[PDB]
Design an enzyme around this catalytic site. Structure first.
Site, PDB file in Angstrom:
ATOM      1  N   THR A 225      -6.222   7.260   7.268  1.00 12.13           N
ATOM      2  CA  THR A 225      -6.630   7.540   5.884  1.00 12.13           C
ATOM      3  C   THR A 225      -6.660   6.286   4.990  1.00 12.13           C
ATOM      4  O   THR A 225      -6.877   6.389   3.782  1.00 12.13           O
ATOM      5  CB  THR A 225      -5.704   8.597   5.244  1.00 12.13           C
ATOM      6  OG1 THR A 225      -4.366   8.089   5.152  1.00 12.13           O
ATOM      7  CG2 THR A 225      -5.715   9.875   6.074  1.00 12.13           C
TER       8      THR A 225
ATOM      9  N   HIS B  10       5.748   7.042   6.620  1.00 11.26           N
ATOM     10  CA  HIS B  10       5.464   6.608   5.263  1.00 11.26           C
ATOM     11  C   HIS B  10       5.018   7.799   4.419  1.00 11.26           C
ATOM     12  O   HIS B  10       4.842   8.892   4.942  1.00 11.26           O
ATOM     13  CB  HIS B  10       4.381   5.545   5.285  1.00 11.26           C
ATOM     14  CG  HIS B  10       3.068   6.042   5.790  1.00 11.26           C
ATOM     15  ND1 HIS B  10       2.672   5.899   7.099  1.00 11.26           N
ATOM     16  CD2 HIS B  10       2.064   6.695   5.161  1.00 11.26           C
ATOM     17  CE1 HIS B  10       1.470   6.428   7.251  1.00 11.26           C
ATOM     18  NE2 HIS B  10       1.081   6.920   6.091  1.00 11.26           N
TER      19      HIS B  10
ATOM     20  N   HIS C  80       0.814  -1.221   0.000  1.00 14.27           N
ATOM     21  CA  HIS C  80       0.000   0.000   0.000  1.00 14.27           C
ATOM     22  C   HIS C  80       0.857   1.286   0.000  1.00 14.27           C
ATOM     23  O   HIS C  80       0.471   2.301  -0.596  1.00 14.27           O
ATOM     24  CB  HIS C  80      -0.960  -0.045   1.185  1.00 14.27           C
ATOM     25  CG  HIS C  80      -1.832  -1.261   1.191  1.00 14.27           C
ATOM     26  ND1 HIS C  80      -2.797  -1.487   0.231  1.00 14.27           N
ATOM     27  CD2 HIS C  80      -1.882  -2.323   2.031  1.00 14.27           C
ATOM     28  CE1 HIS C  80      -3.415  -2.626   0.491  1.00 14.27           C
ATOM     29  NE2 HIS C  80      -2.879  -3.156   1.574  1.00 14.27           N
TER      30      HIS C  80
ATOM     31  N   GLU D 162      -2.766  14.004   0.560  1.00 13.60           N
ATOM     32  CA  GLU D 162      -4.049  13.583   1.089  1.00 13.60           C
ATOM     33  C   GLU D 162      -4.768  14.800   1.640  1.00 13.60           C
ATOM     34  O   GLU D 162      -5.913  15.076   1.273  1.00 13.60           O
ATOM     35  CB  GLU D 162      -3.835  12.522   2.171  1.00 13.60           C
ATOM     36  CG  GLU D 162      -3.117  11.281   1.652  1.00 13.60           C
ATOM     37  CD  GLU D 162      -3.526  10.015   2.384  1.00 13.60           C
ATOM     38  OE1 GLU D 162      -3.543  10.031   3.633  1.00 13.60           O
ATOM     39  OE2 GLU D 162      -3.827   9.005   1.710  1.00 13.60           O
TER      40      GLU D 162
ATOM     41  N   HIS E 254       2.547   9.293   0.877  1.00 10.71           N
ATOM     42  CA  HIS E 254       1.477   9.164  -0.088  1.00 10.71           C
ATOM     43  C   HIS E 254       1.874  10.098  -1.203  1.00 10.71           C
ATOM     44  O   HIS E 254       2.178  11.242  -0.946  1.00 10.71           O
ATOM     45  CB  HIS E 254       0.123   9.602   0.489  1.00 10.71           C
ATOM     46  CG  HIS E 254      -0.288   8.872   1.732  1.00 10.71           C
ATOM     47  ND1 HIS E 254      -1.025   7.706   1.708  1.00 10.71           N
ATOM     48  CD2 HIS E 254      -0.096   9.162   3.041  1.00 10.71           C
ATOM     49  CE1 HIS E 254      -1.250   7.302   2.946  1.00 10.71           C
ATOM     50  NE2 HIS E 254      -0.697   8.165   3.775  1.00 10.71           N
TER      51      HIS E 254
ATOM     52  N   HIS F 139       3.881  11.186   6.509  1.00  6.43           N
ATOM     53  CA  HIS F 139       3.111  10.937   7.721  1.00  6.43           C
ATOM     54  C   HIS F 139       4.016  10.258   8.717  1.00  6.43           C
ATOM     55  O   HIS F 139       4.496   9.162   8.446  1.00  6.43           O
ATOM     56  CB  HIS F 139       1.881  10.047   7.441  1.00  6.43           C
ATOM     57  CG  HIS F 139       0.768  10.753   6.723  1.00  6.43           C
ATOM     58  ND1 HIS F 139      -0.312  10.094   6.163  1.00  6.43           N
ATOM     59  CD2 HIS F 139       0.582  12.068   6.464  1.00  6.43           C
ATOM     60  CE1 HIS F 139      -1.115  10.985   5.610  1.00  6.43           C
ATOM     61  NE2 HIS F 139      -0.595  12.185   5.778  1.00  6.43           N
TER      62      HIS F 139
HETATM   63 ZN   LIG Z   1      -0.580   7.911   5.740  1.00  2.98          ZN
HETATM   64 ZN   LIG Z   2      -3.162  -5.082   2.123  1.00  2.61          ZN
END
Ligand SMILES: [Zn+2]
Ligand SMILES: [Zn+2]
Ligand SMILES: [Zn+2]
Ligand SMILES: [Zn+2]
Ligand SMILES: [Zn+2]
Ligand SMILES: [Zn+2]
Ligand SMILES: [Zn+2]
Ligand SMILES: [Zn+2]
Ligand SMILES: [Zn+2]
Ligand SMILES: [Zn+2]
Ligand SMILES: [Zn+2]
Ligand SMILES: [Zn+2]
Ligand SMILES: [Zn+2]
Ligand SMILES: [Zn+2]
Ligand SMILES: [Zn+2]
Ligand SMILES: [Zn+2]
Ligand SMILES: [Zn+2]
Ligand SMILES: [Zn+2]
Ligand SMILES: [Zn+2]
Lengths: 259, 259
Positions: free
Chosen positions: B197, B93, B63, B105, B95, B118
């Site tokens: 999120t 991490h 992800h 985000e 995004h 984040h």
């Molecule tokens: Zn995040």
């Molecule tokens: Zn997963």
């Protein structure tokens, strides 16, 4: 400690910590004592219809390896026996040991076998696998013992592909397998109401354990024991002894389809 | 369809199917409108203590990618601000987007940034991360905007290691990273009560979103976009546009720590 498994830290012995059902009324596997598991003439004969079984892929999920089937039609189905319904084949997998003297989950008069084959089916009544596992008659698992003897020709195509899914998370296309190559000569069986033998240990399985074991060569079982619980790059943990020992039978009867 | 993600089939738009909290009262991210997000003089100053931050490993979970920290002591902690307690750093991490014009985000007056960092902390009140996420003040996440400009020297060691975790499930040892290399010049911020999120979208996060973005080079963000959502051997799905768009603010106030 990280999440469940078969090691000293995360094994069957410790699954009661996150799964209180582990000490429930209907847990599997059990020991099948032949002196108490009496014959039931009310049991209809078992109908194993696997002629149109359409396999798709083989994968290592870190706990064992699964061959997965198309479950979108009544192609491979299980009927009669103790089952009220049609049960579609979704996958099969094995549980085996680090030595020929162990590996099976079920036992017969305390005897352990070198491995055990579980063919997993879900009741079409509920619509899909996900909804079925939340009902007590949702799953039917057909369990078959392996002994070390002569080679099983039906097992060899599985064995050939095992190098290509050594570590956790790997998978491969695996088409035109016929699961009939793993069935024994006879379908005489014991049946009892039970559970999944791995987490989440849900009590939703009608067990059908075949009396007659299949024979596999030592060369073929050695190939199982080269698999890895771990992912690629992580430290090596050999995928062996991936079995739950026998559980208390409690207020349950093991019915037998035979003499 | 298989399990959640950011594609046409499994994206943010469809997360309400298995997660009814997705339409809840406290969902994140939000758009920070500067005309309504008024200044609050009752907010104490934020204390970011990362001098003893001990990183352990970097991994791709399918992800995004996470750098994970030792959370066993008060080594990297977050204090004051809107927080009542000590919050330990567990991971960070990103995004990001498929184009420089998107990836964040949170948004500021509807403006999107190329990415968002984040830094994730849990309240020591509850004992561990697992227990904390089940309480409304369990998590504090420190959110930082990235713009495409000049290179961030503090980000380069992360970027160098990204080839070694291209596909899902891969990881690597990643020690002696200093997360202070990713902080901007100023710690002026907005805060509001929100959620994770990504699934399970639990409403347990006190959000702290820094006013001032950090600059990263186009060469560095290109390296993010070579990552893969998929596992090794599976078909290629580029890990891009892994962000949830803004959600309804509802009965919440976004307090500002500044002028
Ligand atoms: Zn995040
Ligand atoms: Zn997963
Ligand atoms: Zn023990
Ligand atoms: Zn215990
Ligand atoms: Zn006996
Ligand atoms: Zn047939
Ligand atoms: Zn697992
Ligand atoms: Zn099994
Ligand atoms: Zn294929
Ligand atoms: Zn024969
Ligand atoms: Zn018979
Ligand atoms: Zn590889
Ligand atoms: Zn759509
Ligand atoms: Zn919908
Ligand atoms: Zn405005
Ligand atoms: Zn400091
Ligand atoms: Zn290491
Ligand atoms: Zn400056
Ligand atoms: Zn200021």
């Amino acid at each position: 400690s990280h999440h469940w498994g078969y090691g000293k830290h995360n094994g069957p012995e410790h699954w009661h910590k996150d799964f209180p059902i582990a000490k429930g009324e209907r847990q599997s596997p059990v020991d099948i004592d032949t002196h108490t598991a009496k014959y039931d003439p009310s049991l209809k004969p078992l109908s194993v219809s696997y002629d149109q079984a359409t396999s798709l892929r083989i994968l290592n999920n870190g706990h064992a390896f699964n061959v997965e089937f198309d479950d979108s039609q009544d192609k491979a189905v299980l009927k009669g026996g103790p089952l009220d319904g049609t049960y579609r084949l979704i996958q099969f997998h094995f549980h085996w040991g680090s030595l020929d003297g162990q590996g099976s989950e079920h036992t017969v008069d305390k005897k352990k076998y070198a491995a055990e084959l579980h063919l997993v089916h879900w009741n079409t009544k509920y619509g899909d696998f996900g909804k079925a596992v939340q009902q007590p008659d949702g799953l039917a698992v057909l369990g078959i013992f392996l002994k070390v003897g002569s080679a099983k020709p039906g097992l060899q195509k599985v064995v050939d592909v095992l190098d290509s899914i050594k570590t956790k998370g790997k998978s491969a296309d695996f088409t035109n397998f016929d699961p009939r190559g793993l069935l024994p000569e006879s379908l005489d069986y014991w049946t009892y109401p039970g559970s999944l033998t791995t987490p989440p240990l849900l009590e939703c399985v009608t067990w059908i354990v075949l009396k007659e074991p299949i024979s596999v060569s030592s060369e073929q079982v050695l190939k199982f024991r080269k698999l890895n619980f771990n992912g690629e790059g992580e430290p090596e943990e050999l995928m062996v002894d991936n079995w739950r020992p026998a559980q208390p039978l409690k207020n349950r009867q093991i019915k037998a389809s035979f003499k």
